[PDB]
Amino acid sequence: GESPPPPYSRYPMD
Amino acid sequence: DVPLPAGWEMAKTSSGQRYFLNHIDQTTTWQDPRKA
Predict the structure, then answer these.
(1) Contact across the interface for A5 and B19, Cβ inside 8 Å
(2) What residue stretches are annotated with the WW domain (chain B)?
């Protein structure tokens, strides 16, 4: 049961 | 390139989330591609 992951757009986390 | 696949976004959160992006496939992956 994972919570929604990084958006594919450019970078996941800053 | 072996410990971290090439063309993949390798980032692990201290929350305990190991995610790998396919920067080639444009897809998000939760489960480590090295174990399939």
Answers:
(1) yes
(2) 2-35
